[PDB]
Every structure is written in structure tokens, then in C-alpha cells.
Design a protein around this ligand. Structure first.
Ligand SMILES: [Mg+2]
Length: 530
DNA sequence: GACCACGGCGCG
DNA sequence: GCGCGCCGTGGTC
């Protein structure tokens, strides 16, 4: 890319482009260019020029496709060096960094971005020559997935705006009721939203016992974990907890979301970031729709705001304990495989009563993070000696797991990275740090990655297979929440879509244990998840 | 207006 | 106790 040739470029050229802002559904296309065969082409007028391309090839290809889709153009994303770099090392999350690392500089000029894409792809494609397992993931998973993601982003999800507007007004009144009561008890008003000001009121002015400290600055914590333990030591604690929940939900979801309705589509549009996590998971932002409330009663009222287009229904599909099932497969623990094989509730089969079923439930999902025998003692109110005993029992039942954990750590130590089932890797150097706390944190990141990552690989593969089947049925894929999918289907075909999608997901890639999926259909995200 | 670090907390 | 992104605060620029 030196010789400047008039627009348009030949087929298979690498594209460069500049957006007025990061969100492709909200961005003005400021500039457009392309590079191939030692030439560089600059679009005279970007929007018109966008019609000439057959495929978005280059850095951030998906983002350009979303924008093209926004304009009614079918311009699928192709090769993207970010995906190649992300597979080589998932700390490769930005074009700045990737450019610097593999032979260029991420500028604000379209033509230069185009030439940077061509050059980087050439280099990175070289790195992946011989990495057959990473190459497989690029071709069979990441690249095809990027097209699926572009369609999800361009499609958006419908939101009951009036409903949320109304909800805001109600919650505002309850928050006022809580804050006024807090201020009485405090004997003086202050900024309840300021944790620094709260810290002094609680532990200095009210003399409540401080418990824990914040991580970075070592102030006395006012976290929910701390407050919970004080729910009895003063009536102000409960009111603050109730205040925290309402203001969190109101300020993060109820108020901002209605203002984000796109004028042209009348729907809400997220971004599914494909090179953003250390484990291979997607992330979601602007806004994040992967952390919409669901666990509390108010959270559930908010979720009801996500609804199906008129004439359609939402279809919600959820993998059941995918990470546990993946661990059974990776570890090869016969006993745990056995609990899934004969379709047991696990949390009781593993218990091998009330406390024992809930204890087994938490521990089953604690071994994946390396839950400390302490937090366990906290969760069961059982001494640190008894909790520490369970874990040993849990592992005596499922020895292959400890062996896998230990084997995973040992290998990570030697090679400097760990792998998912498909060979997606994460580099974790701190496995040999000499500070115990730091080393043991790296360890928990390290042996969790193959599990969380494998689950992500499976879900991604499932999306790639499922998407074409949905198009041919006239249904849409709307959201992905790590181990869940939310589709939208015409009422007539909803039931059939629900049936097919479930089967696709369960049979995406058979393991030593079966994958289970629950599927519901409904007019709103909450209704559909029942 | 924008950036950051932090504590805090929403979800899987 | 793993993986994220966003809030308000507090501080800067
Ligand atoms: Mg943080």
C-alpha cells in the first residue's frame, strides 16, 4: 500500500475505516479505504463506497459489518487480524496493542488502517502457520462467529420503554423513603452514595465494628458482605442494603436503558466484544446486556422490560451446569461423569437433606473458582475445621478432579499457559510468583480457564451452527449470556425453533457426559425463562 | 467535557 | 471465589 489508486479496490482487499464513535450502530462513517497488491484506495464518499465491497476484511471487520447492516447492506465480516492475535494470546484485546506487537501503528486515518490490516494479517497468519488447533478455532469458530455477532448487534432487542419510565418514578419514591430514614438514624444527612462518607458514619460515628478492608487503598469496607454481617448490630444496616439495591438497579438499568433506543430500528443495541476476555468468553457493552438483573424481585420487574416484537415470541435456552459437565469431561472423573450419565440432580447425588443439598450445590460451583475453605465456613456457618473437611471429602469422591487441577497447574507452570479442550490458550506467568497470595490467585485463574473457556468454545460453536438454521426459519438470534441464548421467533414457528435450537445446542460437540438445555417461550425475557 | 482509579455490584 | 462492564465518587486535566 504505497501507490494510490482511485476507488474502488479489487476483490479481497483489506479495508480501513474511521468511526465518529466506538459504537457501530451509533457511529458516523467518517472515512473508508482499502489495501491490496501494493495499492491503497480511498473512498471519495464513505457511505456510497460501502456498496462496492463484497466483504469486510481487516481490523474490527465485524464493527464495519454492523454499520453496513445498519444501512441495509449485506456486508459480512471476513478475516480480522484481531481474531488471529486474540487466539495467539488473549491479552491481545486492542488494535493499539496488536498493531504495536505485530508490525504497525493504529492511527486515525482510514488508508493507514487499511494498510495496517493487510500488513498485520500477513504477519499474524505466519504466526498461526503450524498452530493447527488455533487455526481450527479461527476457521471453525471465531471467524464465522463474527458474522453471527454482527447480525445480533444490528438486530437489537425490543424494550418496553413506557414501562421502565413508570418504574423509575415508583422506585425514586422508595429510595427517598429509605434515604430519609437512613439520615434520621445517622442523626445527620450525608451523601449515602459516597462509600467514604458512609464508612465514617458506620464505623466511627456509630461505632459499628469494621470487618474487612478494601483491596487497593485499605479503607474499611462497606461492601454488601460486610453489611450483611451487621444486619443485626443496627437498624441502619438493613436500610442501607435496601438503598444499595434500588439505586444500583435504578441508576444502572432503569434510567439509562430507555434513552438508548435507536431511532431507526426502535430497538436496543448491544455490542458483543469478541476479543475482550482472558478465557475466550464474549463480553457485552454499550450497554452491557449480559448482566441485566434477574435474581431479586425488582430485578425481575426490569427483565420483564425486554419483550418480543409484535407477532413474535422470545425463546430462551439455558445450558444446565455446563461448567461442571465440562469439568467431568476434562478430568475424566468416573464418579462425577456417573452422576451426569444417569441424570441425577447432582447436588444431591454428590451430597453422597436440606443443608446437605444446599452445601453440595455451592461447593459444586465453588471448586471451579477455588473457593476457600473459609468462605465455605461462612456460607454454612460451620467452623473452619468442618468446612475444610467437606472439601477433602468432596475430593476423595472426585479424585480425578484434584488430579486434573494439579496436572493443569503443573503444566501451566512449565509451558507458561493453559488450554481449553479445543486448545484455546491463556498465558499465566504468575504461577511461579514468590508471593503466595499472588501465586495462588494466578493458580485460580489458571485452572478455571480450561473450564470457563471450554464452556465458551462450546457455546460459540453452538451459535455458529445454529444461526444458519434460524435464518432459514425466519427467526433471529438476539442475545448470548455466556451459557444462555435468547432468540426471537415468529409465533407460528416459535415452538419448532425452540425444539431445533435446543437440539443443536445439546449436540454441538458431544462429551463424556450429556449436555442438557432448558428452553422456554414467552412474550418477555422473564416469561420465556420459565 | 474527558480521563482515571476505586469500591461496589449486576450477570454467567 | 473465576470472567466481565458500569455505576457514582473522588480527583485531574
Ligand atoms: Mg475495577
Amino acid at each position: 500500500a504505497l501507490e494510490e489508486a482511485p476507488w474502488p479496490p479489487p476483490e479481497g482487499a483489506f479495508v480501513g475505516f474511521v468511526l465518529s464513535r466506538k459504537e457501530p450502530m451509533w457511529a458516523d462513517l467518517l472515512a473508508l479505504a482499502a489495501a491490496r497488491g501494493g495499492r491503497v484506495h480511498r473512498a471519495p464518499e464513505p457511505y456510497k463506497a460501502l456498496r462496492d465491497l463484497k466483504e469486510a476484511r481487516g481490523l474490527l471487520a465485524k464493527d464495519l459489518s454492523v454499520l453496513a447492516l445498519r444501512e441495509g447492506l449485506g456486508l459480512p465480516p471476513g478475516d480480522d487480524p484481531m481474531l488471529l492475535a486474540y487466539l495467539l494470546d488473549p491479552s491481545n484485546t486492542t488494535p493499539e496493542g496488536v498493531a504495536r506487537r505485530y508490525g504497525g501503528e493504529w492511527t486515525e486515518e482510514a488508508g493507514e488502517r487499511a494498510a495496517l490490516s493487510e500488513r498485520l494479517f500477513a504477519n499474524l497468519w505466519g504466526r498461526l502457520e503450524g498452530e493447527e488447533r488455533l487455526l481450527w478455532l479461527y476457521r471453525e469458530v471465531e471467524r464465522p462467529l463474527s458474522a453471527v455477532l454482527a447480525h445480533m448487534e444490528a438486530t437489537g432487542v425490543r424494550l418496553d420503554v413506557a414501562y421502565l419510565r413508570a418504574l423509575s418514578l415508583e422506585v425514586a419514591e422508595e429510595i427517598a423513603r429509605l434515604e430519609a430514614e437512613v439520615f434520621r438514624l445517622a442523626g445527620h444527612p450525608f451523601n449515602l452514595n459516597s462509600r467514604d462518607q458512609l464508612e465514617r458514619v458506620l464505623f466511627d460515628e456509630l461505632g459499628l465494628p469494621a470487618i474487612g478492608k478494601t483491596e487497593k487503598t485499605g479503607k474499611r469496607s462497606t461492601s454488601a458482605a460486610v453489611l450483611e454481617a451487621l444486619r443485626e448490630a443496627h437498624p441502619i444496616v438493613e436500610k442501607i442494603l435496601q438503598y444499595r439495591e434500588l439505586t444500583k438497579l435504578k441508576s444502572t438499568y432503569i434510567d439509562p436503558l430507555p434513552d438508548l433506543i435507536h431511532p431507526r430500528t426502535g430497538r436496543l443495541h448491544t455490542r458483543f466484544n469478541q476479543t475482550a476476555t482472558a478465557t475466550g468468553r464474549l463480553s457485552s457493552s454499550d450497554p452491557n446486556l449480559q448482566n441485566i438483573p434477574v435474581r431479586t424481585p425488582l430485578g425481575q420487574r426490569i427483565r420483564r422490560a425486554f419483550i418480543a416484537e409484535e407477532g413474535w415470541l422470545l425463546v430462551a435456552l439455558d445450558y444446565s451446569q455446563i461448567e461442571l459437565r465440562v469439568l467431568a469431561h476434562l478430568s475424566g472423573d468416573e464418579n462425577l461423569i456417573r452422576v451426569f450419565q444417569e441424570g441425577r440432580d447432582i447436588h444431591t447425588e454428590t451430597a453422597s437433606d436440606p443443608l446437605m443439598r444446599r452445601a453440595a450445590k455451592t461447593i459444586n460451583f465453588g471448586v471451579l473458582y477455588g473457593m476457600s475453605a473459609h468462605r465455605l465456613s461462612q456460607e454454612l456457618a460451620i467452623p473452619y475445621e468442618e468446612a475444610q473437611a467437606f472439601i477433602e471429602r468432596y475430593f476423595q469422591s472426585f479424585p480425578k478432579v484434584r488430579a486434573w487441577i494439579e496436572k493443569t497447574l503443573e503444566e501451566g507452570r512449565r509451558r507458561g499457559y493453559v488450554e481449553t479442550l479445543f486448545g484455546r490458550r491463556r498465558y499465566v506467568p504468575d504461577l511461579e510468583a514468590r508471593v503466595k497470595s499472588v501465586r495462588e490467585a494466578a493458580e485460580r485463574m489458571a485452572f478455571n480457564m480450561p473450564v470457563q473457556g471450554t464452556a465458551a468454545d462450546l457455546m460459540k460453536l453452538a451459535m455458529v451452527k445454529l444461526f444458519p438454521r434460524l435464518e432459514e426459519m425466519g427467526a433471529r438470534m438476539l442475545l448470548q449470556v455466556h451459557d444462555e441464548l435468547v432468540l426471537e421467533a415468529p409465533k407460528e414457528r416459535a415452538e419448532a425453533v425452540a425444539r431445533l435450537a435446543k437440539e443443536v445446542m445439546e449436540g454441538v460437540y458431544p462429551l463424556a457426559v450429556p449436555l442438557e438445555v432448558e428452553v422456554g417461550i414467552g412474550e418477555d425475557w422473564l416469561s420465556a425463562k420459565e
